[PDB]
Amino acid sequence: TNFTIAGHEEFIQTSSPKVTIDCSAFVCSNYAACHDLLSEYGTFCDNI
């Protein structure tokens, strides 16, 4: 016999933080031997 109007809310996730990883700098710091050894592995960092 009588009515009103209610209000709801809804959140839908759309985006996400764009995470970029420096594979070379993460696996090896500023050291020469580490980079020299990592250069003999392949393209793992490239694939990442």
Partner: protein, 49 residues
């Protein structure tokens, strides 16, 4: 591109001066050589060698 790092511009060197010597040669060249059954031990700390 690949990462980089700021190159150092100086060098810090801090050490305690005016310290005695360890004198390990006087301990190794003693006239009292023990045996493996009663081997001896001397601790060297706070000295220069």
């Amino acid at each position: 591109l690949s990462g980089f790092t700021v190159k150092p511009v100086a060098t810090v060197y801090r050490r305690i001066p005016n310290l005695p010597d360890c004198d390990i040669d006087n301990w190794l060249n003693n006239v009292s050589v023990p045996s493996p059954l009663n081997w001896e031990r001397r601790i060297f700390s706070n000295c220069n060698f």
